[PDB]
């Protein structure tokens, strides 16, 4: 199987909540072609759904090097840092995801802006404690 076919099989497993199996298929595609960003971005989300944040950080770091303009990778990076309460970095990454989304016209409705507000509100909440 080619790397593209492996990404498609990992995608099918992800839709069925098969997160660990999907991450294995994404690692497959990385072995075959390790220079495609979305392979890391998709597996990062698998790790993110698996409560393994440090693992999710790494893949978000790998994706943003192959594609510094990736809206999805910045979005998962910020959400991952948010769940780890790294609020300032998280808001900065969600903000850049929003900036890139408007540049590439990937800003749909109030989606990413609502993520910003939820992150900023959670940051305000923790500062008080
Ligand atoms: C195709 C696919 O994976 N869709 C999808 C829909 C919803 C969610 N999760 C929630 O709505 C909370 C994940 C994936």
From Swiss-Prot:
- Induction or repression: Up-regulated by inflammatory signals in regulatory T-cells (Treg).
Tissue expr: Expressed in differentiated myotubes (at protein level). Highly expressed in skeletal muscle, heart, pancreas, brain and placenta. Detected in kidney, liver and lung.
Q: Which residues of the full protein are shown?
A: 24 to 152 of 303
Sites where Phosphoserine occurs are at 2, 126
Taxonomy, top ranks, is: Eukaryota, Metazoa, Chordata, Craniata, Vertebrata
Q: Reported effect of changing residue 7 to A?
A: Loss of interaction with FOXP3 and its ability to ubiquitinate FOXP3. Loss of interaction with SMAD3, HSPA8, HSP90AA1 and HSP90AB1. Reduces interaction, ubiquitination and proteasomal degradation of NFATC3
Note the coiled coil stretches, chain numbering.
none
Function text: E3 ubiquitin-protein ligase which targets misfolded chaperone substrates towards proteasomal degradation. Plays a role in the maintenance of mitochondrial morphology and promotes mitophagic removal of dysfunctional mitochondria; thereby acts as a protector against apoptosis in response to cellular stress. Negatively regulates vascular smooth muscle contraction, via degradation of the transcriptional activator MYOCD and subsequent loss of transcription of genes involved in vascular smooth muscle contraction.
User: Which disease appears in this protein's record?
Assistant: Spinocerebellar ataxia, autosomal recessive, 16: A form of spinocerebellar ataxia, a clinically and genetically heterogeneous group of cerebellar disorders. Patients show progressive incoordination of gait and often poor coordination of hands, speech and eye movements, due to degeneration of the cerebellum with variable involvement of the brainstem and spinal cord. SCAR16 is characterized by truncal and limb ataxia resulting in gait instability. Additionally, patients may show dysarthria, nystagmus, spasticity of the lower limbs, and mild peripheral sensory neuropathy.
Describe the effect of residue 42 to S: In SCAR16; reduces protein level; reduces ubiquitin ligase activity; does not change autoubiquitination
Q: What is the effect of changing residue 5 to K?
A: In SCAR16; reduces protein level; does not reduce ubiquitin ligase activity and autoubiquitination
What UniProt notes about the protein's domains is: The U-box domain is required for the ubiquitin protein ligase activity.
Paired cysteines (S-S): none
Signal peptide position in this chain?
A: none
Protein's recorded name: E3 ubiquitin-protein ligase CHIP
Regarding how it is modified after translation, the entry says: Auto-ubiquitinated; mediated by UBE2D1 and UBE2D2 and enhanced in the presence of MAP2K5.
Other facts noted in the record for this chain:
Antibodies against STUB1 are found in patients with chronic lymphocytic leukemia (CLL) and in colorectal cancer patients.
Question: Start-end of the TPR repeats?
Answer: 3-36, 37-70, 72-104
Tell me how this protein assembles: Homodimer. Interacts with BAG2. Interacts with E2 ubiquitin conjugating enzymes UBE2D1, UBE2D2 and UBE2D3. Detected in a ternary complex containing STUB1, HSPA1A and HSPBP1. Part of a complex composed of STUB1/CHIP, VCP/p97, CHRNA3, and UBXN2A that modulates the ubiquitination and endoplasmic reticulum-associated degradation (ERAD) of CHRNA3. Within the complex UBXN2A acts as a scaffold protein required for the interaction of CHRNA3 with VCP/p97, this interaction also inhibits CHRNA3 ubiquitination by STUB1/CHIP and subsequently ERAD. Interacts with MKKS. Interacts with DNAAF4.
């Amino acid at each position: 199987p080619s790397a593209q076919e492996l990404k498609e099989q990992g995608n099918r497993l992800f839709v069925g909540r098969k997160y660990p199996e999907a991450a294995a298929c994404y690692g497959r595609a990385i072995t075959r072609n390790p220079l495609v960003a979305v392979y890391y971005t998709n597996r990062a989300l698998c790790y993110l759904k698996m409560q393994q944040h440090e693992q999710a950080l790494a893949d978000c770091r790998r994706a943003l090097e192959l594609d510094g303009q990736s809206v999805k990778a910045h979005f998962f990076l910020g959400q991952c840092q948010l769940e780890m309460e790294s609020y300032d970095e998280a808001i900065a990454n969600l903000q850049r995801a929003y900036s890139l989304a408007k540049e590439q016209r990937l800003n749909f409705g109030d989606d990413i802006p609502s993520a910003l507000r939820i992150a900023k509100k959670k940051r305000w909440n923790s500062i008080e404690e």
